[PDB]
């Protein structure tokens, strides 16, 4: 049934039209805090701001602003924090938020450098023996181990609140081949990654919301969260034909502007959910099929 709508949209060639429909219908809420002059150097992009009503507040008295938004999906029963790629001066804020919000996973969908341009600060440590200290926020971050696959890397990090000496294990899911304003290689590559995030428990209600970012935190991350929410909805109602993807995206856009940055990203989200539905509808084998088609394993020596 959702397939019918997709095929119909494909055959008619109106993805750009449906996408501009969404853009016109999208919530427009104020972003006053984000626009204050004292926050200018806390925003990566002038055209990407969190709404005042859903922004994450840092628990600090000096300045509580971080370019991050809480996407709370009541019906799906999941929350996500969508944020920009941290700036050199906001890496401390970023890990502060992770701590305060009790997040267990960070999903990164960009590379620090793309097309010879810096898109995100190196906010995590690359070598076990070179930990990072964020003094402004009294936090220490250490690389424990990493698992490098062909198009993504999972990293196990330890976050330490120096004040209380309490420590937490953060999982870092880094999608390394997803270009800005582009789409993943295949549905299998995207879904294999998504279900790796799910299998880690990072999305369990027993934790804070997962943090999802890219460079701006709306395009690739919007694609990621949209697909995950629709698949949750499909599992709860059990009826795939009930889930209206466009309605879900508009809901999400009440909490952060610009989610899904291209019509092709919108088209891909449909593809991903339709394919992912195979798992919802009870095909145990399909998860191994995604792993093969993703070619995640690297070549030995």
């Amino acid at each position: 049934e959702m397939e019918k709508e997709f095929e119909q949209i494909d055959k008619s060639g109106s993805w750009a039209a449906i996408y501009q429909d969404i853009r016109h219908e999208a919530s427009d809420f104020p972003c006053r805090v984000a626009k204050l002059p004292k926050n200018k150097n806390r925003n990566r992009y002038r055209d990407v701001s969190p709404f005042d009503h859903s922004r994450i507040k840092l628990h600090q008295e000096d300045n509580d602003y971080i370019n991050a938004s809480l996407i709370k999906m009541e019906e799906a029963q999941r929350s996500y924090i969508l944020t920009q790629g941290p700036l050199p001066n906001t890496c401390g804020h970023f890990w502060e938020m992770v701590w305060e919000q009790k997040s267990r996973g960070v999903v990164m969908l960009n590379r620090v450098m793309e097309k010879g341009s810096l898109k995100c600060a190196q906010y995590w440590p690359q070598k076990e023996e070179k930990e990072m200290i964020f003094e402004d926020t009294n936090l220490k971050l250490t690389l424990i181990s990493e698992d490098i696959k062909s198009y993504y890397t999972v990293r196990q990090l330890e976050l330490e609140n120096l004040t209380t000496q309490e420590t937490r294990e953060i999982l870092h899911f880094h999608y390394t081949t997803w270009p800005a304003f582009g789409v993943p290689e295949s549905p299998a590559s995207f879904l294999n990654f998504l279900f790796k995030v799910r299998e880690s428990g990072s999305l369990s209600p027993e934790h804070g919301p997962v943090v999802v970012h890219a460079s701006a935190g709306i395009g690739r991350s919007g694609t990621f969260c949209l697909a995950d929410t629709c698949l949750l909805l499909m599992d709860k109602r059990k009826d795939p034909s009930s889930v209206d993807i466009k309605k879900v995206l508009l809901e999400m856009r009440k909490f952060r502007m610009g989610l899904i940055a291209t019509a092709d990203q919108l088209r891909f989200s449909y593809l991903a959910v339709i394919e992912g539905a195979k798992f919802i509808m009870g095909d145990s084998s399909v998860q191994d099929q995604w792993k093969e088609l993703s070619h995640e394993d690297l070549e030995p020596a």
Partner: peptide, 6 residues
């Protein structure tokens, strides 16, 4: 240059 969508 300081805009996400150009």
């Amino acid at each position: 240059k300081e805009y996400y969508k150009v």
